[model samples]
Target chain A: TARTAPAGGEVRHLKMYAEKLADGQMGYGFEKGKASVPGPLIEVNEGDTLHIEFTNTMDVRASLHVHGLDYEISSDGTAMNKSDVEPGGTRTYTWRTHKPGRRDDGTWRPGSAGYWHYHDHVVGTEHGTGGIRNGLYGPVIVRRKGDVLPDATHTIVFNDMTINNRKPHTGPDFEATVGDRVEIVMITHGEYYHTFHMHGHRWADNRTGILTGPDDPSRVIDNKITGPADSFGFQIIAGEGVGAGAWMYHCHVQFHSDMGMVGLFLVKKPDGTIPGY
Target chain B: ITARTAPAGGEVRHLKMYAEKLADGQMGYGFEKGKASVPGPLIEVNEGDTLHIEFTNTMDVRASLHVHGLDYEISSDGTAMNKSDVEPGGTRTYTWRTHKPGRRDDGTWRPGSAGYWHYHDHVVGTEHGTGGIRNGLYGPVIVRRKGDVLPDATHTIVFNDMTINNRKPHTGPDFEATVGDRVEIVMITHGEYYHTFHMHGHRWADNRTGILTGPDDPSRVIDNKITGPADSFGFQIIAGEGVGAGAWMYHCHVQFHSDMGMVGLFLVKKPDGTIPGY
Candidate 1:
């Protein structure tokens, strides 16, 4: 019963599905009945507990892996010991979210490399495209341990993708005005290699694929509960001291980039423009 | 009565048809008539008098164009000579023979550039997608002036455009090829921009566009007549360079080339590792 009431922030729900269709058709069937999982996005007052749940439903058995957090190995959702649900299965998961402004590990630093998500480790045909390709993820927003909202900023999602047979087709072609500060969130979904490139600006430390390792001492595994996944991060600014051009963001996977899986964001003329943005 | 005749060393016929049809609902009024014109191999006979027409028609308008002995300007059966017929409900009787090849207003060799078989004028809209793109107006017409019978090198035909829009869907993939070996053809399109090229064996040349007006007339003007409206050309390499390995690709000069009406050729060359080529 580790139910910590949400203090306040934005919350998003994502439903995942996998299915098989007739010849020349495509669909996604929710594995079991636990068809969806909503990653936690909390906007809380100081000292508020982060709350979440893992609901499962499908003919086969499945469970969620809430990767990278400082918790008892038993409580960690790794493969070893997990509370699962069968067909028509449902389970509730909760955690007292702490001050992100500090480290979860022994190091008392400013927010231990923040951002992560969840996924179901199931087997069979559902494993590959379903558990992964399906929508089993959302953003993990870290609230600074002590603070109300500062001047409002914008949030953007950077995605590394290989599509359309590796031809460059990334385009968010959005324009941003000067004096607008922004925080970006990126997500990775496929099993291929990708290098995200931003043309006009640098990012503020990317946490798209960072994860903590498995929790086991005899196993000599670095407890993934609180470490960076492959030590990855990024920091960048969009319109500050940069040239004004049709800037691009794309995956280095040439083939994947060619496959229409890329985008771009633009910096407006800076004088003043329309606001359908 | 203008009629021109040329002898047949490697004689072939160049006969064709013209038609007019409604949109998709081709019922009755949309029927076709035929028009035949002698278009190639300016046959050079011993004398110049008797002209023959290989007239053949199934359901379209039937007509013929027999050039007078070398006197083309006066009787070239073009649709623009204040000419009737060759239209939807018309039939032309092309009868005239030339004694020799003549010159155009610019003193350029008349009959356009020679070395082509008699072919159809593809009346645009209606006749473009039918079999006329392939089998209709294409017959062998050899023109040999009063001279000695030259040695027979492999005969070649080049069209104004790189692809025959009328030939694709009407025929199968419309690919020409030979089995068990490779054949090569130096295809040149006197048009704009590169084409997405595909050949058998090795991939020779990337997608090539842009006009190579040809070194022969390097400074020549690229007009509608010189390069044509489409401004593309297909060359035949009879040398059998890369003609084996079954059906191959002979496609466009751009990235969505085949989709842009710029791809054709499924060549099947003669086997025995031997080709009668230059």
Candidate 2:
């Protein structure tokens, strides 16, 4: 059974740290020594609130700027707004979400539920070009009340020329059982443009990547184009129509794939065995 | 016919077209020779309608008219491989047909021919028409369903390579409107690079018509969308909705791309004459 997100209205506190990795790259983590390139997955239900106590351990200045959420100017996390932190300094960035409803003007305000991301806006350059180029971004998923849940979730970011900051030809592959419901967050960053394509899978081009019955007119596509700072999410039943095997997902820029922007979705059988290799 | 709502469509139509070379060494398709404009002219139609276009090639080199998301046999495919391409000073009748959504023989439903589509040359420099699309040789085609909401005006924006409609960067084919006018945009992408089409102060539902089919639509409302070559989508926005009359920017979100010109303006005006700022 899939585990769905519960109703919100709870306030949570998290302590996060930004530190330089042993490989000369930057990362975000919850602990002092351990950090990751894609930071951490921040999942919340609609109407939830988060106050992140972020400590910038790196010598250079850094700040957290999130998208698709509600935050005051104090949490703008930009140099122009003076919200960035100095080395060894800690700052509290409060993030909030809202539910969809009608307004006094009879206009419908959409919920904050979306596939979003966060990045350092003040690291290196004002736009954090250096931080992102190295590794300083992560995924955020907001769930609505009754949205379909997934058995597993994975983040795949096409940053610059790498996926999840991994080297070319090396895969940040994901594994799941044949019947597992899997969710994927696809994000793009940095200088180049890309087309994200997944073999043996397709998704409805909508908020949750699932159709809302027969009335929904969204196109079901297996490939999508993405640009810098763009993000989207979808959930699929692993090996639903196609049998369990190694399904390749890659940047469909053709040459980018030739340059090593490919990964796999390793779907295993009930007995935990792959079909071929 | 000008009206608030679209009329039922099933009409058969005919048009005359020309493929000509521009003064700047680019090529274009127009309703007439020597009158061709970049991004050419729009070919608007409705579901259930058919058009027979006698396309004349005025250029010394060969070219053809190929369209997207339509019903055309191999002969009307507008590809040189099919021998559908017209020779210099020669003309070919390219017929395109459309249909509405309905039931299939298997009891499965079929989607209608309603979508944001376009047409381009497929016989130019590269057999795929890369050379022709890089210049102009392209335009938009809007196929509407019956009862679809009509707009006060419709504009087309083609991000052909680094340029917008073959115009130099920063310079524009900018569009204008009154405060309450319903303005529609046909956004299409062609050429080499992919781009993020973003508009400040406005958002659209990512669906068939770019307008949400009401609250039931679970489509994401996004202000910035990524598009690749031959990708096309469209939306309609109320001029200065909520945020008052002002100069809003529309550009590619790729930092360098935006910095290097893939940009334009949505110049919404007040009821009276006068923009808020110069």
Candidate closest to the true structure, highest lDDT: 2
* Cα lDDT computed for each candidate against the true fold: 0.33, 0.84
Q: Please provide, for model 1 over A58-77, each residue's C-alpha lDDT reduced to its tens digit, 9 standing for 90 to 100.
A: 45555554444333444444
TM-score of chain B of each: 0.41, 0.97
DockQ for model 1? 0.01
Docking category of candidate 2: incorrect
lDDT of 1 by residue, B150-193 (tens): 33232222332334332332232354434533232222221112
- Clash counts for the predictions, in order: 117, 0
How do the predictions measure up, each by TM-score?
Answer: 0.34, 0.71
lDDT of each residue in A103-189, candidate 2, tens digit only: 443434566788888888777666677788778999888888878888888999999899999999998889999888899998898
Worst lDDT run of 10 residues, candidate 1 chain A, spans: A216-225
> Which residue pairs collide in model 2, if any?
none
